[PDB]
Each structure stands twice: as structure tokens, then as C-alpha cells.
Amino acid sequence: VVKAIARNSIGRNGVGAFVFPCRKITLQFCNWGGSSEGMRKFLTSKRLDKWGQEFPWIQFEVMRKSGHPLLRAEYTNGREKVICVRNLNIDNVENKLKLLKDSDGDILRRRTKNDNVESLNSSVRGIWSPLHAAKRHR
């Protein structure tokens, strides 16, 4: 007889439809404090409208808090990236926005040498077997 071992499928983003990793960006600032002069000028400029038009699958907030500026980015996987933008000018805040946008939310990691491909599929040619070898050893 045959019994079934229940399992679940693995999400493979990109093979079918590609869902963009970032989902929400928050542009927090303060109306009092020199640390947010750059973010203020960014929000008053015409750049934020351009960013909305060009990337309209991302949800943009702007919020006022009595503290340092910030840039929160929620991603599909669930994590959140927060950037402190103290004492930065307009272009630097924009560049930090670029980094958050074009990044998956994965936790930063350390990679070994040549560790560049991660596949969840099996091997087209099976694992080497000494018994089923090209030519027998000695």
C-alpha cells in the first residue's frame, strides 16, 4: 500500500510572477532640529513626487515626530530596515532611499568563498557513486 507524507510548497519569487521585495517606505522627520533639515528639504522638493510616480508599487508615508529623522522600509519577507538620517543633505537622504528600495529585506549575512548559488532542486546527474564510477579505482 501507499501512504502520503504531507508537505507544503516553497515560495519561489521570480519564476512565475515577480513581487517586488519592498512594500512600504516611511519618511519620518521633525519640525524642530537641525538634524532633519535635509529630510525637510527633500519632502518640500519635487523629488518625492517623482519617486511615487516611478515606483508606484511602494507605499510612502511622511510622519512628524519629536526626534531624529528616519527611513523605515517594510519588505515582503516581514523584516524592516530603519536608517538614521541625522545631519544629511537632500542627495544623501535620496541615496539612502535608493538603498532601501533596491534591497530585499534579508538579514545581512557572511558568505564563504565561491558560495554563490543556492538551489532547492535536486541534481540532474546524481551524486558520485564509487560503485557506479567512470573507471574503477586501481
Partner 1 sequence: IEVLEPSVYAQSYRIKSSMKKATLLLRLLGGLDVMKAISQCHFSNKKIAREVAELLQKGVKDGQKLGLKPEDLYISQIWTGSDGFWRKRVEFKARTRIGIISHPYIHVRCILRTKSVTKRRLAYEAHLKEQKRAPWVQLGDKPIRGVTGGVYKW
Partner 2 sequence: ESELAKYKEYYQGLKSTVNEIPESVASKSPSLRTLHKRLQLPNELTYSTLSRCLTCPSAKLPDKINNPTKGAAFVNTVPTNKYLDNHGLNIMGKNLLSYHVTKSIIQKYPRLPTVVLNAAVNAYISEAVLAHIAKYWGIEVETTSVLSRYLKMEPFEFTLGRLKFFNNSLNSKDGIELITGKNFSETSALAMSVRSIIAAIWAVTEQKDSQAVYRFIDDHIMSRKLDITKMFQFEQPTRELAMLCRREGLEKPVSKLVAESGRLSKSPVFIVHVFSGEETLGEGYGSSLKEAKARAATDALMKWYCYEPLAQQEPVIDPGTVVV
Partner 3 sequence: KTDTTPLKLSNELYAIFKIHNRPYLVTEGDRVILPFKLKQAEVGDILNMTDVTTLGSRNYKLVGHPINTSLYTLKATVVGKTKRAFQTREVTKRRNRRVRHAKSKGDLTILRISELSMN
Partner RNA sequence: AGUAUGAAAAUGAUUAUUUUAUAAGCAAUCAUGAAUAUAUUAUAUUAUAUUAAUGAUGUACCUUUUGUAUAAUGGGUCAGC
Partner RNA sequence: AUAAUAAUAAUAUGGUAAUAGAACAUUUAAUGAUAAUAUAUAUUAGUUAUUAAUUAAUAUAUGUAUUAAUUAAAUAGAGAA
d(CA 17, CA 71): 28
With CB under 8 A as the contact rule, the residue among 3, 7, 46, 111 that binds partner 3 is: 111
> Minimum Å distance from CB 5 to partner 1?
16
Question: Does 119 participate in binding partner 3 (rule CB under 8 A)?
Answer: yes
Question: Does 116 participate in binding partner 3 (rule CB under 8 A)?
Answer: yes
| Beta pairing partners, 60 | 25
Question: Does 136 participate in binding partner 1 (rule CB under 8 A)?
Answer: no
Between 109 and 136, name the residue whose CB sits nearer to RNA.
109
CB atoms within 10 A of CB 100: 20
Q: Please, which residues have CB within 8 angstroms of residue 51's CB and are 6 or more apart in sequence?
A: 60, 97
* 3-class SS of residue 36: helix
Between 29 and 51, name the residue whose CB sits nearer to partner 3.
51
